[PDB]
Design a protein around this nucleic acid. Structure first.
Ligand SMILES: [Mg+2]
Ligand SMILES: [Mg+2]
Ligand SMILES: [Mg+2]
Ligand SMILES: [Mg+2]
Ligand SMILES: [Mg+2]
Ligand SMILES: [Mg+2]
Ligand SMILES: [Mg+2]
Ligand SMILES: [Mg+2]
Ligand SMILES: [Mg+2]
Ligand SMILES: [Mg+2]
Ligand SMILES: [Mg+2]
Ligand SMILES: [Mg+2]
Ligand SMILES: [Mg+2]
Ligand SMILES: [Mg+2]
Ligand SMILES: [Mg+2]
Ligand SMILES: [Mg+2]
Ligand SMILES: [Mg+2]
Ligand SMILES: [Mg+2]
Ligand SMILES: [Mg+2]
Ligand SMILES: [Mg+2]
Ligand SMILES: [Mg+2]
Ligand SMILES: [Mg+2]
Ligand SMILES: [Mg+2]
Ligand SMILES: [Mg+2]
Ligand SMILES: [Mg+2]
Ligand SMILES: [Mg+2]
Ligand SMILES: [Mg+2]
Lengths: 209, 114, 121, 56, 127
RNA sequence: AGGACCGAACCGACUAAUGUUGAAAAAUUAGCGGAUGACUUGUGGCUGGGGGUGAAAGGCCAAUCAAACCGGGAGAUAGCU
RNA sequence: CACAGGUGGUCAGGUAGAGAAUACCAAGGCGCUUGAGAGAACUCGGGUGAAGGAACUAGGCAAAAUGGUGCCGUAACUUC
RNA sequence: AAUUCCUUGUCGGGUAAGUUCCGACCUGCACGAAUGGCGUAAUGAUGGCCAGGCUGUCUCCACCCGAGACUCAGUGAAAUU
RNA sequence: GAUGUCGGCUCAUCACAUCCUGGGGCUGAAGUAGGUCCCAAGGGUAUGGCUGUUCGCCAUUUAAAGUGGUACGCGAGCUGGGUUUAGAACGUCGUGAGACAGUUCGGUCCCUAUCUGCCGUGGGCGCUGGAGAACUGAGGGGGGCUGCUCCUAGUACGAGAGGACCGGAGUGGACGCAUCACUGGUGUUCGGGUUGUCAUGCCAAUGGCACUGCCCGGUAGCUAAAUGCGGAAGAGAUAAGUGCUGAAAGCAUCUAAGCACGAAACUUGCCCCGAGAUGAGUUCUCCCUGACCCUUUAAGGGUCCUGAAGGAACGUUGAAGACGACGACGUUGAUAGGCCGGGUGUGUAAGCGCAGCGAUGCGUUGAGCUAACCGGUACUAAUGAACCGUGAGGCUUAACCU
């Protein structure tokens, strides 16, 4: 229900003396429907849209054929919405970078968390510690595992044993958008935004309510 | 992006502070401040200076006061905390920026080194 | 700012050092900032002034080392860890005058007596 | 600490189910006797495209 | 876990590497082609390249610096007078990484690493 | 002058970490105590098991000590496993 | 055991230093008989840490800390 | 109290708060005069308590430098069952 | 032929006889606050002083500081203060060796994980031609805390004192996720200062070593104390409770038919995983339409010619990572390194000139140097092929069709 393009760095807009404003400025070029899912066939509602167009000279055939209407055009990713009334485009019939959000609404940036990698019980969950007075073997690190005793230890498949942090999605949810820039598509948000450099990102509407 | 992303920054902090700091300048870095209810009014601050220079948010110029007790502001450069332009103290920038001495008396930065 | 810790007195009657012993404002308060009320214990005092060693009252934190900063992010910070006693059941400041510079977060209509003394911001 | 009872053979083999093998028999030569890996010929007689310092 | 562009690698203590390459790089100029390990190779670039590049007009200030990073007059001369101008016309890329692999002693990569050279003569420009 | 004072060699072992299938059947690392004295050490000699030696802990007497090691009485005895 | 332990005596260079400490070096002797990459959790040995400063804990355990020559100056008590 | 069971005795002190500590009291369960009594300057890697300094001991952990841990090539164990 | 004690740390999981918050009934319930009982386990549920303590008392917080089960949860996870070894002592007992359900000072805490279990993460094969993708959503998990203030309203209520309901508005404490733009920490790969000494022939200038020798400051990145956002509304069906209508029982009655409300509980709403969902689903797009033979012939077995879409392999690599995996790029090229420019950080190099007996100073000069950065540039390396994967897709039935 709104384009989705990569972000790049974050800034500050100081006027009237906020400066607190920590813009994310995540460029959102053209979208282009490319496909329109519907009731009969395609399954549910939905409405694909590849809000990109990065020159992809070398691409596998099926995707290179995945386009079909007027200009053709090619991108890479491929999202969609659901209920609405979006066009029947292909990578033709541009959507817009100025989705209908008026000027003061909260967006819902969605990206993939950075990736720490394998991480201890110390970093994964703030529950860990241990002291330094003695027994340096189990220093301020290793936990004291699943309690219980004779209960064979079904370990209750959780606690927080060390494991990689993941890159999993995040969806900050609720973020008032400050600027958009109709033609110089950037759209600034207020801090947050997961991932780095130029992760795909999604930037939904305002479902958070 | 070369000159189209970093471009908003470069088109905001677009001021003319003094293009050069040589400490000890008690510039009333007049900062609009504000107070509440009415009165805009602004009152600056005596100085010394140590800083940083970057991020389009050159959030710095530790101005270290001596009145009654002690120090600072990281007074960047933009908006409702204005004009800092003044230069009233000369120099003695010997170790130059990042002059962490934080001492209270006969310790001068012999300015007038011109 | 955390239990123990040592602040000053930017006012008077029984001065100098006074240790914090409780950060008020709900369970697990970690620290207290400028503007925050705190449980203090007179640990120095002057032979005179209605305030003496061992005495337990409440007190605000007028100035401190972590430093204040907001809007743009201008960070004033002192190395003058204030106080300024507070007679217990009425939170009015206990003391004739007040020493040192304060701030605009103390600018609240609640202390007030405090920001109209020691001519300073 | 220790195994409480002997791991069967159906177990040791079933544990070694990752012996792995290479030898993709990829491009070896482009101008010699079939030698050279997928990148450099026979050093001191190899070269990528042409005689590198020494050849025959 | 993961980190990011912490450019250059580790091997031994901080000082070792910044001490070994002094031996490595200086050795490269003495000859043409060497034989190290791929990892060491790609690393030897960042040290040898600025050396090749530091040579423009010496001016002593630089023959002083070159004598500092390599600490060896023997090769410091080559850097400026002979080795230097061989590429005085071209930007960077004065190093080749010709692989090999197979150590036998430990079974790890190798790579020669060299740089175009030939003989010392003088001519007039042509093309 | 001194069973005097600070402190290396040398002698000793108060503390913590590591080691605990060790580098090591008691150590390594950082500290620590004595250091002209009831000091410390080389070589050789003398005390023998109910015996020795002991500023005393049942400590030491060859990785063994509320009675050493080796061989013997010996296939001790074992209402126990 | 080609074992981070034990083993008596002799010799005693330069700069610095009270010095057979300690640091850098002479003469001289060595890199310690698996190596090459990687740059996770966690373990061992270290460096630096905002504000606080013993709240830790059985206990300030461990750390951090003090540290030199000269001179000023130094309490209870005392077998002086 | 290295002796007190009741016991965190009672009073005082230090503390915001002190089952420990220091000074008293005496009701000594169950001190006591060479199986020594009460003191005692000096000394103590001795037990207990307080303070200043100091700090990652801690609030609450962050980063970093190295030896392992991981991957490849060589050699190649262990208890247990 | 060994199931390690109490307390602490770490990290927990359940019950409900519920401490706080949520909803109700009665009250000797005006209000505010309470008392008690019913319902309710979503979430939440203190720092210290003393002591080995659990507990307890005390200081001060808090919405509150719940009771209990889990080998009085938790030592192949930490501690070793209490308590049973050997030393020594006091009181007391004993002629004594010694002893104490007394006290006191000192006193070695092992184990490289095979199986179950977990937290992560790959390799097979299967989903019936093989591929590249985008989904659906059966299921599964996470999350569910709450203070204060203002408006309502100084109103209802009240003699005053005091002071709501309902509903709304802002700002917090604790917790969770993300992220470095700010504030900062680090930053032994950047710059500088400086102590001792060896060397580069010497001056000068530099380098090695001494914790990075000591130290000052700091790029990127990582980071919290920094910054930004979230625990919601709204629905379904309820708990206790309250009710309508109404018999049995002419009335009455919340129940017997039927209807209506009703809580942080339950289902959903929000975030993540998610078709091995073997019940292996859906949609879109891409590729393969050459010949023969022997059988025991509908089962095949086999040879030559072919080998696509794609995958993988290798290489340059990455904000991705233990290894695998995953993303980008391979000359139709910015994927790494180098090189140009800029930024930044350090703080005005070296050399030369002049002043000063000299240390030293000034000028050249805000110089010199400068990383992981930004903009750009094919200079170096990413080679042409080769490998795997085929050759039009089983039977039965129903419907549609040249
Ligand atoms: Mg141990
Ligand atoms: Mg079971
Ligand atoms: Mg890296
Ligand atoms: Mg003596
Ligand atoms: Mg020692
Ligand atoms: Mg001595
Ligand atoms: Mg002898
Ligand atoms: Mg013996
Ligand atoms: Mg015998
Ligand atoms: Mg016989
Ligand atoms: Mg027998
Ligand atoms: Mg050896
Ligand atoms: Mg600190
Ligand atoms: Mg304590
Ligand atoms: Mg505690
Ligand atoms: Mg200590
Ligand atoms: Mg130390
Ligand atoms: Mg007493
Ligand atoms: Mg007696
Ligand atoms: Mg006696
Ligand atoms: Mg109940
Ligand atoms: Mg307690
Ligand atoms: Mg238990
Ligand atoms: Mg253990
Ligand atoms: Mg004990
Ligand atoms: Mg005994
Ligand atoms: Mg060094």
């Amino acid at each position: 229900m709104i384009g989705l393009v990569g972000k790049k760095v974050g800034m500050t807009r100081i006027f009237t003396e906020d400066g607190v404003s920590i813009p994310v400025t995540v460029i959102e070029v053209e979208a282009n429907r490319v496909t329109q899912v519907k009731d009969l066939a395609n399954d549910g509602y939905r409405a694909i849209q590849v809000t990109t167009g990065a020159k992809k000279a070398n691409r596998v055939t099926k995707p290179e054929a995945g386009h079909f209407a007027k200009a053709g055009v090619e991108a890479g990713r491929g999202l969609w919405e659901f209920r609405l009334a979006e066009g029947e485009e292909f990578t033709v019939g541009q959507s817009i970078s100025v989705e209908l959000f008026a000027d003061v609404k909260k967006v819902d940036v969605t990206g993939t968390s950075k990736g720490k990698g394998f991480a201890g019980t110390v970093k994964r969950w703030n529950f860990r510690t241990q002291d330094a007075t003695h027994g340096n073997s189990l220093s301020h690190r290793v936990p004291g595992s699943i309690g219980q005793n004779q209960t064979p230890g079904k370990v209750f498949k959780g606690k927080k044993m060390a494991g990689q942090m993941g890159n999993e999605r995040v969806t900050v949810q609720s973020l008032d958008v400050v600027r958009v820039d109709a033609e110089r598509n950037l759209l600034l948000v207020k801090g947050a935004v997961p991932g780095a450099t130029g992760s795909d990102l999604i930037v939904k509407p305002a479902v958070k309510a | 992006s070369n000159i189209i992303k970093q471009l908003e920054q470069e088109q905001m902090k677009q001021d003319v502070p003094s293009f050069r700091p040589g400490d000890t300048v008690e510039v009333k870095v007049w900062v609009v401040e504000g107070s509440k209810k009415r009165l805009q009014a602004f009152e600056g601050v005596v100085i010394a200076i140590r800083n940083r220079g970057l991020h389009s948010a050159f959030t710095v110029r530790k101005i270290s006061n001596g009145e009654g007790v002690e120090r600072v502001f990281q007074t960047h450069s933009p908006v409702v905390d204005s004009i800092s332009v003044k230069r009233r103290g000369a120099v003695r920038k010997a170790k130059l920026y990042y002059l962490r001495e934080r001492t209270g008396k006969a310790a001068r930065i012999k300015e007038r080194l011109n | 700012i955390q239990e123990q810790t040592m602040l000053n007195v930017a006012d008077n009657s029984g001065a100098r050092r006074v240790m914090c012993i409780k950060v008020l404002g709900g369970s697990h308060r970690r620290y207290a900032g400028v503007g925050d009320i705190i449980k203090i214990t007179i640990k120095e005092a002057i032979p005179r002034g209605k305030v003496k060693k061992g005495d337990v009252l409440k007190a605000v934190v007028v100035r401190t080392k972590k430093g204040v900063r907001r809007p743009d992010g201008s960070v004033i910070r002192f190395d003058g860890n204030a106080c300024v006693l507070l007679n217990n059941n009425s939170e009015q400041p206990i003391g004739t005058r007040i020493f040192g510079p304060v701030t605009r977060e103390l600018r609240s209509e609640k202390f007030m007596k405090i920001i109209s003394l020691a001519p300073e911001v | 600490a220790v195994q409480q009872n002997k791991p069967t053979r159906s177990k040791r083999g079933m544990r070694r189910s990752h012996d792995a093998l290479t030898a993709v028999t990829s491009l070896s030569v482009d101008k010699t006797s079939g030698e050279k890996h997928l990148r450099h010929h026979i050093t001191a007689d190899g070269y990528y495209r042409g005689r590198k310092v020494i050849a025959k | 876990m993961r980190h990011r562009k912490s450019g250059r690698q580790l091997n031994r203590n901080s000082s070792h590497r910044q001490a070994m390459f002094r031996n490595m790089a200086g050795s490269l100029v003495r000859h043409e082609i060497i034989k190290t390990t791929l990892p060491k190779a790609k690393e030897l670039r960042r040290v040898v390249e600025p050396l090749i590049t530091l040579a423009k007009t010496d001016s002593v200030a630089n023959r002083r610096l070159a004598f500092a990073r390599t600490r060896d007059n023997e090769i410091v001369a080559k850097l400026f007078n002979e080795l230097g101008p061989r590429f005085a016309s071209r930007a960077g890329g004065y190093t080749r990484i010709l692989k090999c692999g197979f150590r036998a002693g430990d079974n790890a990569p190798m790579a020669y690493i060299e740089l175009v050279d030939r003989s010392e003569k003088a001519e007039a420009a042509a093309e």
